[PDB]
Design a protein around this nucleic acid. Structure first.
Ligand SMILES: Cc1cc2c(cc1C)N(C[C@H](O)[C@H](O)[C@H](O)COP(=O)(O)OP(=O)(O)OC[C@H]1O[C@@H](n3cnc4c(N)ncnc43)[C@H](O)[C@@H]1O)c1[nH]c(=O)[nH]c(=O)c1N2
Length: 459
DNA sequence: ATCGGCTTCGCGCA
DNA sequence: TTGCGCGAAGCCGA
């Protein structure tokens, strides 16, 4: 039995007599899954089978092959891991509000379970689902270490107000995962799906002049197994010097975990457990935990309590006041979406970062902050900057379309979870970042040098 | 309370 | 490079 405040009753009803169906969505993995572990639990009590259903919405069209290969290949692996433990996996195509409801009837599901996501479109779908089912319907936070609706009931103004809260709750929720018990009872194509999708997304590929792709797909092998190794090599090779090199992009000293945590291919709670027991720097473990605990989960807190998380209106009062005061200011440059996208600005280090984004699908965490603040400076308005920053983040980051994306863009452009700094023209009081500031931190000429000879080779 | 502390910004200066 | 003190800055929360 697991901690019962990880569950929240979406719909009450009378328990069916069919199997218990887990509607996977955020947490695409079989280990370390409070949503899967809970569903198994209530099917063993009901003495019924547990099964997984996954829905494949048209959303893969609003991004690239890169994200879809990465996630489809992952699911190809999960489906096998699940049938190992005797748990069937069903793959729906279409709109959840309709297809999940149909499945719930067509298999005679006795209880519905899902994982937790704060993006508006899950609440939309869930709310259709509730309407068309009669069975009970459960939702489990399987993504955060502390259930979002439990760490805080309000928008948290800053990391230092969240932090005493989150940490006062870890002795309760930071625990080991039990074993996923195979099915005892035995209930009664993703190859085409992955081909069909790439023939669709192929006319939109990001190509170089010579028509081979920009994207390089060997930096991150998708899937649960590949993720475990990225966690272990992190703990053994990179964790010890994270604190002191987090900010250098010429070093590859990050965890590189974010494509995995986004597709739920690995549990942040598992990471935390392995980091905690590891014996590296106390400084570095502090650095690291605060990014995967405080910053990650306050990003869910943000989107969960501010339905306008991808818009201007969600900036803090002072932020908007300041930015409106400077809408009339003359911008040093202005660039269009296309120009940013193609890395055609005056700033070679900015374009360098953009080139890291296009070719690899994961931009360095420090360069990300620089990236968005310089979009605000050379956009024609704050709204356009947001719109540009979201469109390029979500289109090219393997970890895009994610609460961290919005809560990081908002931190960057609109000062959300941050404070006021010295007033500038165009960018108001938003924390400024400078090219020369980057030079006191790392060897910009190497970072630039790495992605040079790719703007020329692309168009 | 009223007032200390804040993702770790940039920049001078040693 | 690297570290320190400083400056400009709105406000939570204890
Ligand atoms: C403009 C902009 C845009 C984005 C983001 C930040 C900024 C300023 N982020 C957040 C952060 O840049 C990103 O999570 C890390 O670079 C992920 O790479 P690593 O896992 O290697 O980092 P690293 O190992 O240093 O970080 C560990 C984990 O902490 C979390 N994290 C780190 N910094 C964070 C931040 N500022 N906000 C929220 N979570 C943070 C992530 O969960 C990350 O996996 C984001 N993240 C993401 O997952 N998807 C995205 O699309 C974006 N987009």
């Amino acid at each position: 039995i697991m901690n019962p405040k990880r569950i929240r009753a979406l719909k009450s009803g009378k328990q069916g007599d069919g199997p218990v169906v887990y509607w996977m969505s955020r947490d695409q993995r079989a280990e370390d899954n409070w949503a899967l572990l809970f569903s198994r639990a209530i099917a063993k009590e009901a003495n019924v089978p547990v099964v997984v259903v996954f829905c494949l919405t048209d959303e893969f069209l609003e991004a690239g092959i890169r994200q879809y290969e990465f996630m489809l290949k992952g699911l190809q692996e999960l489906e096998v891991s699940l049938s190992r433990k005797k748990i069937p996996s069903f793959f729906l195509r279409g709109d959840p509000g309709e297809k999940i409801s149909r499945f719930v009837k067509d298999y005679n599901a006795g209880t519905l379970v899902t994982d937790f996501s704060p993006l508006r479109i899950k609440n939309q779908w869930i709310e259709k689902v509730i309407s068309g089912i009669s069975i009970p319907f459960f939702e489990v936070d399987a993504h955060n270490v502390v259930p979002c609706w439990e760490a805080s009931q309000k928008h948290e103004y800053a990391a230092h107000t969240f932090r005493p809260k989150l940490y006062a709750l870890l002795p309760e929720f930071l625990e080991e995962f039990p074993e996923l018990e195979p099915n005892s009872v035995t209930p009664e194509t993703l190859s085409d799906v992955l081909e069909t999708g790439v023939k669709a997304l192929l006319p939109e590929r990001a190509l170089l002049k010579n028509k081979d792709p920009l994207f390089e797909p060997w930096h991150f092998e998708p899937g649960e197994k590949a993720a475990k190794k990225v966690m272990e090599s992190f703990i053994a090779d990179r964790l010890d010097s994270y604190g002191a090199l987090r900010n250098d992009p010429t070093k590859n000293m990050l965890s590189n975990l974010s494509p995995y945590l986004h597709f739920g291919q690995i549990s942040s709670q598992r990471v935390v457990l392995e980091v905690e027991k590891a014996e590296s720097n106390p400084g570095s473990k502090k650095a690291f935990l605060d990014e995967i605990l405080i910053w990650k989960e306050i990003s869910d807190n943000f989107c969960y309590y501010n339905p306008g998380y991808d818009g201007f209106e969600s900036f803090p009062s002072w932020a908007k006041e300041s930015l409106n005061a400077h809408r009339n200011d003359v911008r040093s440059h202005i660039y269009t979406l296309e120009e940013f996208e193609a890395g055609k600005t005056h700033d070679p280090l900015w374009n360098a970062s953009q080139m890291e984004l296009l070719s690899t699908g994961k931009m360095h965490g420090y360069m990300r902050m620089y990236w968005a603040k310089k979009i605000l400076e050379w956009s024609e308005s704050p709204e356009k900057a947001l719109e540009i920053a979201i469109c390029l983040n979500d289109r090219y980051e393997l970890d895009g379309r994610d609460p961290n994306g919005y809560a990081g863009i908002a931190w960057s452009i609109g000062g959300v979870h941050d404070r006021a700094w010295g007033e500038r023209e165009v960018t108001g009081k938003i924390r400024y970042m400078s090219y020369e500031g980057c030079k006191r931190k790392f060897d910009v000429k190497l970072y630039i040098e790495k992605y040079s000879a790719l703007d020329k080779l692309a168009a």
